[PDB]
Paper text:
IMP-type metallo-β-lactamases confer resistance to carbapenems and a broad spectrum of β-lactam antibiotics. IMP-6 and IMP-1 differ by only a point mutation: Ser262 in IMP-1 and Gly262 in IMP-6. The overall structures of IMP-6 and IMP-1 are similar.
Here, we report the crystal structures of IMP-6 and IMP-1 with the same space group and similar cell constants at resolutions of 1.70 and 1.94 Å, respectively. The kcat/Km values of IMP-1 for imipenem and meropenem are nearly identical; however, for IMP-6, the kcat/Km for meropenem is 7-fold that for imipenem. However, the loop region (residues 60–66), which participates in substrate binding, is more flexible in IMP-6 than in IMP-1. This difference in flexibility determines the substrate specificity of IMP-type metallo-β-lactamases for imipenem and meropenem. The amino acid at position 262 alters the mobility of His263; this affects the flexibility of the loop via a hydrogen bond with Pro68, which plays the role of a hinge in IMP-type metallo-β-lactamases.
Residue numbers in the entry: 4 to 219
């Protein structure tokens, strides 16, 4: 029910927030980013819906910021809902190969661009994608903005609770979170999907939450 929001987080970096009713969670927020590169926009995750995806695209396009592409952090609809809409307007969509395979098994439209392997530059020296290992889902990836020191951790970053465990790898998550912590300890900001922007400390809190969750 709450409207899409778009707020400036840093130079060239915006957080978009969209909202869905999920059984047994109530209203769930979903943060993505929009990164400006040379005055063009990259979507980091789509909103849940084609409607919120249209609104996000229009906000940037009306202000003279052409959409250059989207990258989806994992296969769940809170990352991928707007792929179909983006494809219908010939905006390049990006996902890992495993994210595309899971999208296809789940009867969902796929990104027109895939990458495999651990590191992938969406835009070299500006938008990097890292796979830390399975956690929230087998396919979850994070997006690093080296220039700003900003990690989009997506649905992997779970600083107060692990959320929906439906597709989770509870065995692997702590090791993944271990690896993520070592690599991005130098993060100025960490943006999770389902709770508010924080600092590097969100890496620790997620490790602790993973260790804790595995213990049961
Ligand atoms: Zn998810
Ligand atoms: Zn999520």
């Amino acid at each position: 029910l709450p409207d899409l929001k778009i707020e400036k987080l840093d130079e060239g970096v915006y957080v978009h927030t969209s909202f869905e009713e999920v059984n047994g969670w109530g209203v769930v927020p979903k943060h993505g980013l929009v990164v400006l590169v040379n005055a063009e926009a990259y979507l980091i995750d789509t909103p849940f819906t084609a409607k919120d995806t249209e609104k996000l695209v229009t906000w940037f396009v009306e202000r003279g910021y052409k959409i250059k592409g989207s990258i989806s952090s994992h296969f769940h609809s809170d990352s991928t809902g707007g792929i179909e809409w983006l494809n219908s307007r010939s905006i390049p969509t990006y996902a890992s190969e495993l994210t595309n395979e899971l999208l296809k098994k789940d009867g969902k439209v796929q990104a027109t661009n895939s990458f495999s392997g651990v590191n992938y530059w969406l835009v070299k020296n500006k938008i990097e994608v890292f796979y830390p290992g399975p956690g929230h889902t087998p396919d979850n990836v994070v997006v690093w903005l080296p220039e700003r020191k900003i990690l989009f951790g997506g649905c992997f970053i779970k600083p107060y609770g692990l959320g929906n465990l439906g597709d989770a790898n509870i065995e692997a998550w702590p090791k993944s979170a271990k690896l993520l912590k070592s690599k991005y300890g130098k993060a100025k900001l960490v943006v999770p999907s389902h709770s508010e922007v924080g600092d590097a400390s969100l890496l620790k809190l997620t490790l602790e939450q993973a260790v804790k969750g595995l213990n049961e």
